[PDB]
Design a protein around this ligand. Structure first.
Ligand code: D3T
Ligand code: MG
Lengths: 398, 944, 401
DNA sequence: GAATATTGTACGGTACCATAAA
DNA sequence: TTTATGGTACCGTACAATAT
């Protein structure tokens, strides 16, 4: 479930998800076959990606972004195939279609086939030499990327997921230490924004070859679904991708040259967004201030329409210039009771609701309501921007 | 038939029109006069030329009062101006109670009794008042204080924004935010007097409605300019003399337009106080709150001074201007009304937005040159640069008073805290250095001046103070004139240096630049003037032919021209007072009209017009009278196109065709032999046609080879006195295909025929008449008989300032023409019940706001008004007939906007698409007299 | 072409582009077949996308983001196609391969495939009803999205993907041309804002096959003009086709009337815009400096060290680095470089990397607290106290914006 | 001997105020 | 305590740009 059904209904109604209830099942959401995300979901994903980038890329002096193509054009691939429809139409233009010509066309289509990427590891490993030259051969260093990966789905359907990947190049001796450090850092990052950090857990696992690895789960109401995995892949993939001389693969740590180990950290941002939505859920979605899509809601009371609209427009422009998301609720021609507006904004994870009346024109006091406390508080309109920005900054710091 | 001709084969009016206007019978011209006119025309070889007879116009004019045109106009003017003259007499001859001991502090009007008691009142109930308002410039255009005078008692009004305090007030003006100085419907109509009375009028609640005025304003500035006015040069000399070529006797009978100076000149006594605080200009609302009594006392003092000046000036103005038409026209010229809509707000934003985008683009080009020029400092390389070797390159010293391993959770925290603490330690060493920070030490001195201060709230990174007018901009761009670098001289302006120490404006040896001579850039005003900036409109042709080269050359000059007008006018265009009428105040006709927009904004602008702000008694308005109509390469040039009539209304108006030319021609004809076309100039002026395209302006433009506006400038300069070098300079400026020799030859050929040795010349009679009128003891207008200002009479000025006095006759005749037009149009509107209103008058251009149904009737009334004015001019000069070619308007424009032509779409950089695309404004119509007669059957009645 | 070669060499060397010179031709960059972008190129693209989002989505009260999938599942389609290799192998198992069977297989493959998106218009139009309900049926309103679109490339065959920013505007039919002109002016102003030479950005008028009005925005590359943004007045044909049947759900309320809105499509290419800005940055004062706009420069501040106590200099640099990171300013960690190079080489390297300011910390900073500050545009040193450096940098960026 | 009127912007000089120096 | 010195507000002058 009842809670899951209510949460999905609220998300669809409040423009978090999209589509009808038929395609909004748990399996469709988890497999990446959902029709899409609403604007609030897009904003939440952008906030989560910004937080991940700040906590992984910005604050690290040896982590750099990497750009990887969605398709990998490669012939003679060992072991879905992208085929241009223009070539098919051109072939269908010729009505002969002999046996030999069609067999040759099928062979050419097969081995020239551009695979859709299933992970960002290959593209990051493709930039090993150039990015190593960027850091002037000073191990350790890493490459981070946020993008969309394609996964086949059985039942045929296509499932795409947004993943944030960090590929860490480390000397062999400190590989386990760096793996533990990254595990702790990622677990702390996931627990930071959660109201119930205990639902985020970690586990130890080993691959088929025996390589050490770790997995991070989230405790959904129906069970635990993996959200991030770490692997100690060694140097097998790097050596395979660069056959021949190993001098170019040498990394300098201290005063010695060695082929670095490969550490892969892959996390799913869509499932993380879903987990945070479940954590947030009186029907109020108590999202973290650093992740809430819309923070401030502006409304009007009763009185001179023109002056109230002008004051609301000025405050809206000031808040936009100060980098605060505001819901333009003062343009609503229809009038609704304050209880309904408060319920709607609580369902939309609105941090504060601000209404402007004739008293604001008289002295300059506006009614401020907090989502967590549900208590009104008169405040002067001059320092509202400072209060909001310091609220967000202090919430981020703690 | 209806066709008639003069003894000089010039077509005259129709039989019916002449019979109704000039009557029947008169003194026929003498045969000797006809022979003299024929001889004069034959001497110049301008006789016997056939003329196609213009079609006759037959219409029944409305009944004419009196027995003559003079009597008719005098009766109309007396009927118009009787109640206002009565109110003026009541105000002049009345008692005046002393100022109340203490001013009341309450919202709204209050009446001060004889004992000083204050009783609240809704509106004043007095016919005549002297008015003065107070405006706090730091709060907006809303009025703040106002005190009124009256024969019965004083009156005071306090703005609601001054008594009650609120966090925020309405930024959009409303009728409820102004002063209620009208009585809703024994006596009728009101007179309000004041110094610069348009400013007080603009803050009146009932003056922004579309219905009507029913109130006339009399300005002491206009009467002062009429009586004892001064010209710009005269005012400059007066100010210089007061602070510290002969005949200075005019100093004691003249003063500047300031109220204190006027009071000293006319009334005298103790000088008026000034309150050096200047709270209203520079102050806050609380300052007015604390200093209320002093401000009220100063306003009362200003009102008292204005009242004394008015009661001292009215008899003098009546004596010097006895014609009631002058007073009626002055009263009617102060009710200007400019309707605007919501598109006015969008125009200001688009014009400002386009200005900012273009200004930023030009600045970036100069910033990059400035930024790159700083690299020449190293190695003393600026010495060898031919453009940047004479700047401030000094610098100011800064004054002063392994392996690896992941980190532990606790160890990582400690490292950040230790690093943070160490950085904060250096932050504590701020107790050094000068307290006021230096402005970019170590940078070159010239670059230092181009950067705004760090503490300036308008700070912008880089040299953001650069502009084309700055003296460093040409040096940065390495501008070269004919392959020579540009150099600036204090005593000679901009020039260029010729290496080798070439024919040009020079050389000047006062500039000691080793190894190079100094020449001077040519200027449009001659070799006696200095070029203040090569980035001028004159040098744009000099860049197309490669004479002027940069190192975005043409782009810099082109973009300067686009924003030249908006740079000098954006402050007063954007600060116009606009009052938006509410739904209730709008007429019921507009609401029901389909074009009415519920979500739109309808408002009006009342121009601040001084009716007589010129020695020639011309109206002056800082913004509208000097506003561009529309141009394809000027930002904000569509200012007049935004005066849009409300739905159900349209603007009907026309422009006088060759006003000065016809006035001078008819003066010369009346002085010569008393017949039209006697003078060669008059004969040429009469036969000029605008629809055909062969008029004096057009003929001069075709002969010289310039545009029609340039022809107007050339003709008006020649008439008012301009030398042959001036003519050749004008020709070269307006035509780049003629050299100096050819231009001089053309100017000499043009000037040989005119003027002459005045007798024997083409235009000798008009010059002689103007000199005779100007040099008379008391010069008066030939039509309305209005005396010149006492500061320009021959007794007080002798044989000085002759050109201004000569021009005064023609310009005051044009002003009298405008007065006659206004009074006749008002009479026609009142007689036949035409739902119209005077919109705005621009010298010779008159516009009216009429409903959608009475447009053609208003056009016919305007044509009749023009005919009557021309006939009255002819009768006043002594000629009892009027030529047909100068009888009616060339065209009458019916349009929803103010524009020179009803067809132009007004494409500007700010408005590239056009008026029709932007605001759904269709093109107008330009009807002629025949079309109006066909449409309205030649009658002004509503039933017909 | 010498300038283009030098610019490409600098971009590849300074980690703007990637790959060898063979695949760094103009055609490969324009067609989307380039191997990728370096970290500086990624940062520049992120800055450009942030500027576009702020100037298009943030400041507009009726524009909302929209999420569109890269692949469109196809339940039959008219006319790249994703074909499973397992089905191809199964078909090749049967060696008969008759004409009719192969034709039927080709028809089935064409009917059933997940097409890769070539534009974001279809996905935005797919969210018409829900986003219209979001604005409570108050026209006009729009949907904006930044994403990657796939384009076939001819020359056996290659795949070209481009990053495009698309805005789909729903407007009443009467104001369609007015809104088109307004959006054209706004986009042209936005493109000219960050350019040192705004004249290179131009606009043109064009009409479609059906006669629908449209506009195109070009950039003047050294070799010619390449389109960077297009605007179209598509009417309501696509919207009606996508929603056959009842038109009540498609009605939009403007004023007090209900009408089917017109579709305005604004599509711009962020990759070609980044390339155009890079060309704009790179123009006897020979100097290889990429003068990028402060709001688009990837890295803004460079930190270096002089001579003296290594530990204290490193600690001060670390503290300043942390403060600048907390204040949202990108800093190049140049003080960790063990190798020592002359200041001229570091200045040249930072100029080639579009570094706004270079800061070096010496023993004088430990003594009093004065650090050497050098400006990219002016190339003039200026001593400044370390306390107000953050305020100076943030106010510089804000005032430039 | 062009004539009326309106306005802005850049540049240099003057004098008061707050600071720092002796 | 007494004495240079830069910053800043104000004003006069020259040149240029609008309208009829
Ligand atoms: C331009 C200019 C004009 N004047 C005065 C003198 C007359 C009035 C009005 O005539 P106008 O300019 O409208 O032109 P106008 O002759 O009336 O042309 P139209 O008949 O209106 O076409 O302007 C002047 O003294 N010096 C000048 O340089
Ligand atoms: Mg005229």
């Amino acid at each position: 479930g009842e809670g899951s059904e209510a949460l999905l209904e609220i998300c669809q109604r409040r423009h978090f998800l999209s589509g009808s209830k038929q395609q909004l099942s748990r399996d469709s959401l988890l497999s990446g076959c959902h029709p899409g995300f609403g604007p609030l979901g897009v904003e939440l994903r952008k906030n989560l990606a910004a937080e991940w980038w700040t906590s992984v890329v910005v604050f690290r002096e040896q982590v750099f972004p990497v750009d990887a193509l969605h398709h990998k054009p490669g012939p003679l691939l060992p072991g879905f195939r992208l085929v241009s429809a223009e070539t098919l139409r051109e072939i269908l233009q010729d009505k002969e279609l002999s046996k030999e010509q069609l067999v040759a066309f099928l062979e050419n289509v097969l081995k020239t086939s551009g695979k859709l990427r299933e992970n960002l590891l290959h593209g990051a490993l493709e930039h090993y030499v150039n990015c190593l030259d960027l850091v002037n051969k000073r191990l350790p260093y890493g490459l981070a990327q946020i993008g969309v990966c394609f996964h086949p789905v059985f039942d045929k359907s296509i499932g795409e997921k947004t993943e944030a990947s960090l590929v860490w190049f480390t000397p062999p001796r400190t590989s386990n230490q760096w793996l533990d450090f990254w595990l702790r850092h990622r677990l702390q990052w996931w627990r930071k924004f959660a109201m119930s950090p205990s639902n985020f857990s970690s586990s130890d696992c080993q691959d088929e070859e025996g390589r050490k690895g770790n997995k991070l789960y989230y405790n959904f109401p129906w069970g635990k679904e993996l959200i991030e995995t770490l692997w100690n892949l060694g140097d097998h993939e790097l050596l395979h991708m660069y056959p021949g001389n190993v001098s170019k693969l040498h990394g300098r740590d201290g005063r010695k040259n060695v082929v670095p180990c490969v550490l892969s950290v892959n996390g799913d941002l869509d499932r993380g967004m879903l987990a945070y939505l479940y954590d947030s859920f009186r029907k109020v979605l108590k999202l973290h201030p650093c992740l809430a899509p819309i923070k401030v809601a502006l409304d009007v009371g009763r009185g001179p329409t023109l002056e109230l609209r002008q004051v609301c427009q000025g405050l809206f422009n000031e808040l936009l210039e100060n980098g605060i998301s505001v819901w333009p609720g003062y343009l609503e021609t229809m009038q609704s009771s304050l209880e309904q507006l408060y319920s709607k904004y609580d369902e939309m994870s609105i941090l504060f609701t601000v209404l402007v009346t004739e008293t604001t024109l008289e002295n300059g006091l506006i009614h401020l309501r907090s989502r967590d406390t549900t208590m009104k508080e008169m405040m002067h309109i001059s320092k509202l921007k400072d209060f909001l920005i310091k609220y967000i900054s202090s919430a981020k710091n703690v | 038939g209806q066709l008639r001709h003069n003894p000089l084969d010039i077509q005259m009016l129709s039989r019916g029109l002449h019979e109704q206007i000039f009557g029947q019978g008169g003194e026929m011209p003498g045969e000797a006069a006809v022979r003299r006119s024929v001889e004069h025309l034959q001497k110049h070889g301008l006789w016997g030329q056939p003329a196609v007879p213009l079609p006759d116009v037959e219409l029944r004019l409305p009944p004419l009062y009196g027995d003559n045109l003079d009597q008719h106009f005098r009766l109309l003017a007396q009927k118009q101006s009787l109640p206002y003259l009565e109110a003026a007499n009541l105000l002049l001859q009345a008692q005046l109670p002393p100022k109340p001991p203490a001013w009341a502090w309450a919202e709204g009007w209050t009446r001060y009794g004889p004992e000083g008691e204050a009783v609240p009142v809704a509106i004043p109930e007095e016919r005549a008042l002297v008015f003065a308002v107070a405006v706090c410039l730091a709060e907006g255009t809303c009025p703040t204080l106002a005190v009124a005078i009256s024969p019965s008692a004083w009156y005071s009004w306090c703005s609601q924004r001054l008594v009650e305090e609120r966090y925020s007030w309405t930024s959009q003006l409303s009728p409820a935010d102004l002063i209620p100085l009208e009585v809703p419907t024994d006596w009728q109509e009101q007179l309000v007097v004041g110094h610069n009375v348009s400013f007080d009028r603009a803050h009146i609640r009932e003056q922004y409605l579309i219905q009507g005025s029913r109130m006339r304003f009399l300005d002491t500035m206009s009467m002062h300019m009429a009586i004892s006015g001064l010209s710009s040069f005269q005012r400059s000399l007066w100010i210089a003399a007061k602070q510290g070529i002969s005949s200075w006797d005019w100093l004691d009978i003249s003063s500047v337009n300031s109220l204190a100076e006027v009071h000293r000149l006319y009334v005298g006594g103790p000088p008026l106080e000034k309150e050096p605080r200047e709270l209203f200009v520079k102050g806050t609302m609380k300052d007015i709150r604390e200093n209320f009594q002093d401000l009220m006392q100063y306003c009362a003092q200003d009102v008292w001074a204005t009242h004394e000046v008015f009661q001292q000036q009215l008899p003098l103005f009546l004596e010097r201007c006895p014609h009631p038409v002058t007073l009626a026209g002055m009263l009617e010229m102060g009710v200007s009304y400019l309707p605007v809509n919501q598109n006015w707000e969008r125009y200001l934003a688009e014009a400002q937005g386009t200005y900012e985008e273009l200004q930023r683009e030009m600045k970036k080009s100069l910033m990059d040159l400035a930024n790159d020029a700083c690299q020449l400092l190293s190695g003393e390389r600026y010495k060898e640069d031919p453009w940047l070797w004479d700047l401030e390159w000094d610098l100011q010293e800064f004054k002063q008073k392994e392996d690896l391993g992941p980190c532990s959770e606790e160890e990582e925290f400690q490292q950040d805290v230790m690093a943070r603490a160490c950085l904060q330690k250096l932050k504590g060493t701020t107790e050094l250095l000068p307290k006021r920070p230096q402005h970019l030490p170590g940078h070159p001195g010239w670059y230092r001046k181009l950067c705004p201060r760090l503490d300036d709230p308008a700070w912008t990174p880089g040299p953001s103070l650069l502009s084309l007018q700055m003296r460093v901009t040409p040096k940065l761009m390495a501008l070269t004139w004919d392959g020579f670098p540009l150099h600036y001289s204090e005593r000679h302006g901009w020039g260029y240096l010729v290496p080798g120490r070439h024919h040009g404006n020079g050389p000047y040896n006062d500039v000691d630049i080793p190894g190079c001579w100094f020449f001077k850039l040519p200027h449009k005003d001659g070799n006696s003037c200095n070029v203040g900036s090569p980035f001028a409109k004159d040098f744009l042709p000099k860049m197309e032919d490669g004479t002027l080269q940069a190192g975005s050359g043409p782009r810099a000059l082109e973009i300067n021209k686009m924003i030249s007008f908006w740079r000098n006018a954006h402050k007063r265009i954007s600060s116009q007072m606009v009052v938006w009428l509410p739904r209730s105040a709008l007429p019921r006709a507009v609401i029901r009209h389909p074009d009415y927009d519920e979500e739109g904004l309808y408002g009006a602008i009342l121009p601040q017009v001084v009716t007589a702000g010129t020695i020639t008694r011309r109206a002056v308005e800082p913004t509208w009278l000097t506003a561009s109509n529309a141009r394809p390469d000027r930002v904000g040039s569509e200012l007049k196109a935004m005066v849009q009539a409300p739905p159900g209304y349209t603007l009907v108006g026309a422009d006088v065709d060759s006003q000065e030319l016809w006035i001078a021609a008819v003066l010369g004809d009346a002085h010569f032999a008393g017949m039209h076309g006697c003078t060669a100039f008059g004969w040429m002026t009469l036969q000029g046609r605008k629809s055909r395209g062969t008029d004096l302006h057009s003929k001069t433009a075709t002969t010289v080879g310039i545009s029609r506006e340039h022809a107007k400038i050339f003709n008006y300069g020649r008439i008012y006195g301009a030398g042959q070098p001036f003519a050749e300079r004008l020709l070269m400026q307006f035509n780049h295909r003629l050299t100096q020799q050819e231009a001089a030859e053309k100017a000499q050929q043009m000037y040989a025929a005119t003027k002459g040795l005045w007798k024997g010349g083409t235009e000798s009679e008009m010059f002689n008449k103007l000199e005779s009128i100007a040099t008379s003891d008391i010069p008066r207008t030939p039509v309305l008989g209005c005396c010149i200002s006492r500061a320009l009479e021959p007794s007080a000025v002798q044989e000085e300032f002759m050109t201004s006095r000569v021009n005064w006759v023609v310009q005051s005749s044009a002003v009298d023409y405008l007065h006659l037009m206004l009074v006749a149009m008002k009479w026609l509107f009142e007689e036949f019940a035409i739902d119209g209103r005077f919109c705005i008058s621009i010298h010779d251009e008159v516009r009216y706001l009429v409903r959608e149904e009475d447009r053609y009737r208003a056009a016919l009334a305007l044509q009749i008004t023009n005919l009557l004015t021309r006939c009255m001019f002819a009768y006043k000069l002594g000629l009892n007939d009027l030529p047909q070619s100068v009888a009616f308007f060339s065209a009458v424009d019916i349009d929803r906007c103010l524009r020179k032509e009803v067809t132009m779409d007004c494409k500007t950089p700010s408005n590239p698409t056009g008026m029709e695309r932007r605001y759904g404004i269709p093109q107008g119509e330009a009807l002629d007299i025949y079309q109006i007669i066909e449409l309205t059957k030649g009658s002004l009645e509503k039933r017909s």
